[PDB]
Every structure is written in C-alpha cells, then in structure tokens.
UniProtKB/Swiss-Prot annotation, chain A:
Miscellaneous section: Present with 166 molecules/cell in log phase SD medium. Early fractionation of eukaryotic MCM proteins yielded a variety of dimeric, trimeric and tetrameric complexes with unclear biological significance. Specifically a MCM467 subcomplex is shown to have in vitro helicase activity which is inhibited by the MCM2 subunit. The MCM2-7 hexamer is the proposed physiological active complex.
GO terms, biological process: DNA replication; DNA replication initiation; DNA strand elongation involved in DNA replication; double-strand break repair via break-induced replication; nuclear DNA replication; pre-replicative complex assembly involved in nuclear cell cycle DNA replication; premeiotic DNA replication; silent mating-type cassette heterochromatin formation
Cytoplasm listed as a keyword: yes
Chief location of this protein within or outside the cell: cytoplasm
Gene that specifies this protein: MCM7
UniProt entry tagged with the keyword ATP-binding: yes
A molecular-function term among this protein's GO annotations: DNA replication origin binding
Residues of the full protein shown: 508 to 729 of 845
Domain of life: Eukaryota
Record protein name field: DNA replication licensing factor MCM7
From Swiss-Prot, chain B:
Other facts: Present with 8800 molecules/cell in log phase SD medium. Early fractionation of eukaryotic MCM proteins yielded a variety of dimeric, trimeric and tetrameric complexes with unclear biological significance. Specifically a MCM467 subcomplex is shown to have in vitro helicase activity which is inhibited by the MCM2 subunit. The MCM2-7 hexamer is the proposed physiological active complex.
Sequence positions that bind ATP: G384, D385, P386, S387, T388, S389, K390, S391
Family: Belongs to the MCM family.
Name of this protein: DNA replication licensing factor MCM4
Amino acid sequence: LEGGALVLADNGICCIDEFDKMDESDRTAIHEVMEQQTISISKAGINTTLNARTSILAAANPLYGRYNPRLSPLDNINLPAALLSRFDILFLMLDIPSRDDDEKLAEHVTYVHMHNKQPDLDFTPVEPSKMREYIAYAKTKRPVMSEAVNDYVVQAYIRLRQDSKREMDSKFSFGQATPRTLLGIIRLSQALAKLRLADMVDIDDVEEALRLVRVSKESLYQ
Amino acid sequence: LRIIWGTNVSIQECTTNFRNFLMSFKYKFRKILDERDEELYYIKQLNEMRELGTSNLNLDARNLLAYKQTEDLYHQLLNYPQEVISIMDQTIKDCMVSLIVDNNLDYDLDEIETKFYKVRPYNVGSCKGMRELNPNDIDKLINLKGLVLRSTPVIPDMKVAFFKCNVCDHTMAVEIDRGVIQEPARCERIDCNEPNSMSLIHNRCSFADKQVIKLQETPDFVPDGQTPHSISLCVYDELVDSCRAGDRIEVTGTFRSIPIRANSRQRVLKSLYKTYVDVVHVKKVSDKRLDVDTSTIEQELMQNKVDHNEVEEVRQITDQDLAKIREVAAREDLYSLLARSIAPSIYELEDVKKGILLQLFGGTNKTFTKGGRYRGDINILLCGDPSTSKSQILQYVHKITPRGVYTSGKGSSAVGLTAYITRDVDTKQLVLESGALVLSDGGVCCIDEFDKMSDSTRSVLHEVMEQQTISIAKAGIITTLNARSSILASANPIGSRYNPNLPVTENIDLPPPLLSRFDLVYLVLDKVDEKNDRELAKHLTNLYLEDKPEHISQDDVLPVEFLTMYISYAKEHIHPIITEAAKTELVRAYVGMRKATTRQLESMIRLAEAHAKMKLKNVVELEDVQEAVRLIRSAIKDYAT
Ligand SMILES: [Zn+2]
C-alpha cells in the first residue's frame, strides 16, 4: 500500500487550496486529522487505523469573491464551524483601497518584477537550508510552563470566553473561543519558548499569543 | 572439552549451569533489577507439574539475566535457540530424575522415561518490528506485537515415509532426513533383488501439522513515511486453534528465510529469498487491558483442555487480592472513584464517564433453550459542542479495550464492513477476509462523524443493533455470522454553534428512529461560566507543568491494574438475576418518561443490571433503577425545555 497526498507526509507539512471546492469526503477525513493524527478506513483489504502525524494548511475564498461587509464572517464564509472549531487560527484577508498604501505596494510589486531581488533593505533573509537547520535544532527542546504564566493564561481564557459569548453574538462575531483555543495558545507559547531556546516559559510571550489572536480579525471592523 | 562445529555451545556444561540456576533462583530479579516473602521462584513449577503429566514449560529471559551463572546462557539460547533447546529438553529430564532421587513414589516411572519435554521463552528482549532484520541477524529468538487478519488450514508433511515393496509380502520404512525422503529403490536384495521395484502409500505414513497466519504489525516506533506490512509465518502441531482473528497479540519466534519455485514444473529458483518466521511462543493476554468473555469461548476452552495444550486463555488471580477487592468494595465511594479514575487528565464529565464504565461492565448474557439470546452490549451515542474530549475519550476506550476497531467519516462501505472476498498474492487462489464489524465480536466498535457517513453504510446498522448477526449472500459465500461487539460513537450537531431553543430530537441532521434506538446518549453543551472553567484550566495545565502527569495521581485516583483485574473477575464470575422490587420503579419510570420508545426500557435494564454487577451483587435491586432513570434524564438534560 502507498498512500495519498497526506500519508506521504508525516511529521511534516501539507498545503491545500480551494478547500471550499473539495468534496464532503475530504472534509470527513480532515475533520479527523486536525484533532486526531489517525485515519480510519473500512473499504477493502485496507482496514487500518493509519498514522498521519501531519500539519494542515488550507485556503479558499468566500461565496461572493469579495467580502460582504454587511454580513458576518460566520455567514459570508462557506465552511461550518462544526469543523472550524478545530481551526485554532483563522485569518480573514480582505482588501479595501487607500490612496497611500497601494503606492508603495506597487513600488514593491514593480521592483520585484523589475529584478527578482527583493527590496534592498539593510537585511539579508537567508536560505532554507540554514532555516531548516535552525528549525531542527529548536525542535530538540521540550520546555516547561511555570505557574506564574498559567494563572494569567487562565484569566485571559475566562475573559475571552465570557466576552465573546455575551458580547459577540452579533454582526462581526465568529462563534466562541474554546478549550482548543487555550490549548493552541499553550502550544504556541511553548513554541515561543522553543525559539528563545529556554526550557521554561516567560510571561512575556502569552501577550504575543493573544495579541496575534485578536489581531487576526482587525480588518473586520474597518 | 565438547563443542559443536561453528559453535561455542557445550551440552553438559549447559546442563550443569542450567541445573544450578534451577536449584538456585529465588526472586533474584526483584533484588538485582529493582528494590522490590517467598523462595525458589522456579522450582515450584517443577515440583507441581509432575502428577499432571504435561510435556511443556514456559520460561523468561530475565531470570537468566538476574542469576549470576546465566548471563552467558542468554546470548547462546539467543543465537542457537533450537540447539540450546535440544540441549535443555535433555537437561530438563536430567534435572527431573536428579530431583526424583530424593523421593520415593508410586510407580509413575512407566511414563517419564517415555516422555519428551519442551520449553517456551516468552518475555524476551524487545525487537523493532520487521525492518530491523537485515540479513545479519536471521534465525534468532525474536519478539513482536501485533494483530490478526487471516488463518490458513492445516499443512500435513511426511513424517514416516512408509514404503510398500511390490513382492515378498514385505513392507519397508524410512524417515525424513533434513526434510526429504530418499526412496529406497531396491527390493531388499536378500529376499528379492529388483533394484527399483517399490511403491508408496499415504494412508500409512505419519503426518505433521503446520499452519500459517497472516498478521498485521503494530510497532511502538516508525520512521518518516511508514505504513503497514502483512507477514506470514509457521506454527506447528499442539499449537493449532490458538490464535485467530479478533486478537491483539504479543509473540515470539524465529526470523528465517526460504526460496520458492519458479513454477510447478522444474527446480529453478529465485535469487531473492522469501522471508518468514517459525514460532516459539505466543502471548494472548497482557496487563493493560481486560480479556474475553469467559462464556463466549467455552468450546475453545474445553478443546484446549482435550488437546492438552494450555497456553493461556484467561488471566489468573490471587486470593489476597480477592480479599483486597472485597475490601475495596465495602466502601461507598465506588460510584465516583471509578469515574475519577477512568480519565484523570480530564475534567468532570461524571455521568459520561460512569456510563463508559457501565458499558465496560456490559451487562447480561442470557440465552434460551434453542430460540433466544440476549447479549451484554448497549449501543451508545455522544453529541454536543466540539472542542472537548469526546474524541480523546474514544481513543482512550479503543486503546484500553482489547477487541475493537476505529472508523471515521464517509470513508467506509458495506463491502468493507460485512464480508469481502479477495485473492492471495502467493497462492493466487480465492481466499476471504473478515470484516471490521465482526472483528470486534465482543468489545468495542468505535466511530467518529456519524452524520456525514453514507446512507449505504448507515443502512447496515439496523440489524446489528438488535441481533449481533450480519448476513451475507455474495460469491460462493452464504453464512449468517455473529458480531457481538458493542457500539460507541459520536454525532455532530445540525449546522454549527448550536440552536439552544429547538427540539434537539430535530436539531441534529439525523432522523428519529436511528437516534431513539440508541440505549443512551450524552450531551456536551457549553454553559459557559466560571466555577467550571478555571478549575478545568488548571486541571489541564498542571498536566503540562510536568513531563508526564504522575502528580495527577492526587485527589484519590486508583491504578489501572487492580482496577482492570477487579473488572475482569467481575465480568467473569457474577450473574445478577433480575429482582421483583425493581419492576414497579422501572415501569413507572419508562411510562412517565414516554412523555421516546420501548428500547430505552431495554437500555435501563441492561444498564441497571450492570449497576448490580458493580458493587459485586449477584442480584439487581430497586435502587439501581433509581440512578438509572436519574442519570438518563440527566443525560438528555430534561429540565431545560
Ligand atoms: Zn520384494
């Protein structure tokens, strides 16, 4: 047996595009994968409970191409949150004009199309050989969480829970934060600690976690 | 000096060292391995076994690793197991009759000299699957862990080559010589000399017994890009009708090689040798999960009895722990401590966890004279918000249950659930494969995302939820079989983020009857408020605070082992027959709850009789009905709407 696109991946990465265009079957499988790293099959010879250990990254568009600012993301978007609860992260990347930002946008686009070389910043982004090198070395640790950060995390969880529930049942409101939200905050804080390469967690990280989380949907309000 | 060619193995020194280790082993491994009353660990086996007339014995590796004079024996039974065991089968009879010398006995000595002996090294050094066996280490004692797919029939093999001369009223005889026969062409020259006149008959000859088994490999580690393999092997006589489909197994054997023919036509062979495994011992049970129904398998038990092979079928007990159990059951915080102990890594989910444990008791297994059977299994459903431990619970139960398979989503079909038919890659013949439904026959059948499943796959479970019997009618196959597994699975809501003010018997995207016939359901709505959330927060964080949650053992939690063994003795030795008081509280409960069908009656009784099994009653009682109907209405949350 050789497997599909996913099973060639394990302890690695995938990528998907136009998720909304896929079948209900792919949804049935990935609804398993994102939470549990197995796959179950009962078709023929293959009766496995096979190991995936993979990391999903999809993409799609809404129903109308451009956003419906007078509808919610929970109506404008096509996918159900019965699945999307598993989606620890979610950005909403839409576009509205501005006289000034698109000027230097075109500057960027035009310089890259002029010669492939990116903008001549005083900066050198670096080969992926070295990048996978650093990723692999940071994959070696397994840091720790103190209580000094645990308590603050607990309070922020309760804050967001009650806030999003009682307040955000409305126009720009997506669902409700979850335990999975908290688990993801935890995982990502761990990863921050892994990147600083200390075996413990600082309070200076959870701030970036929740910052980035509520930052993901800032452009929903403009 | 005495020695074997290409070998560093002495016969008589091995015998002496064997005997001295044997006369000297007294829980040494408790001492030298670790910190952990008794005396002469091994010798009791060899004192007891004599009057019962058995030519077998089991054996560890560690007790050699523990005793002084056995450290070199370890690497030598390892490398030359069939040779070291051709020794030890003799050293064992030697030690036998060197130990009988201190005894006067009734004349049992007509047998032991005629007897044989054999050994079974089982708990041995670990091996990493199949990939490890590059050809450096072929033909060596080995261990493995996995489950079963397919069983073959019996291979016989010539074991006494009978031979009929054509004349002179004479037979002839000759035996196998490293696995061949060299027919004597001659005619016993003295009486008659016809240098190629002789015949062959099968009905005379002696046959061996051999069987082959397809197995699925289930490691603890795999590399980057791995996937299942399916291996064949060979068992031989006196082990037959032991290992079959529906069993996880820890095992041992010897890895080996062999070539095959190019045809049925001539002796031209392959550069590459097909691999295989010859068998040394099998482990059918373990500690981290309970065992088969003792009623289910009676015929197999009495068969093994009649066959005088007694490799295990059921784990065995101690009386001091029986007393321990009658002690632990005297207290009254059973009904919650079981719950707290099922899942220490998780928040309360009380009734949920209690129902899991009550299904793990199962219930009642009665039959009628010819026309009835009523089985201990109650089909279970879950429903509610995502972002909880539903899936985690289910993985946990699928692990801890011995005989069960996991299904997901719409990637399944009636064909891959009931019987399907296929072809072997070696024999190229029409051989079958059992279905994932019937594999769990007794135990767990786990599913996730019940809603999106095909209506073709969802059509079959009409009958399995009633009779534990699938039927087939397809190519060359007509037989209605048995699938006593239980059902336990999740559902997902209609739409997303729920609809609090609606009939939830309509709010699922699932019709009534399929849902009503579930013996019970559980509900996972959110009800966001502190005093249930912050506590859970620390409850799940302090797990991460440690490298692994041992300090979760606080707040009164049991270990897995006393638990599981209590469960097994419970499951295997009590039969609560229904009582009279419970009638009048069960009937009114059902009727008043009807204000949605007659199956929740069967649910209440099959679960209250399990409540009776719990506490170790040999009787049901009125009170079990109380918590039954109580927790039922708590399950679907009667109070809100
Ligand atoms: Zn003759």
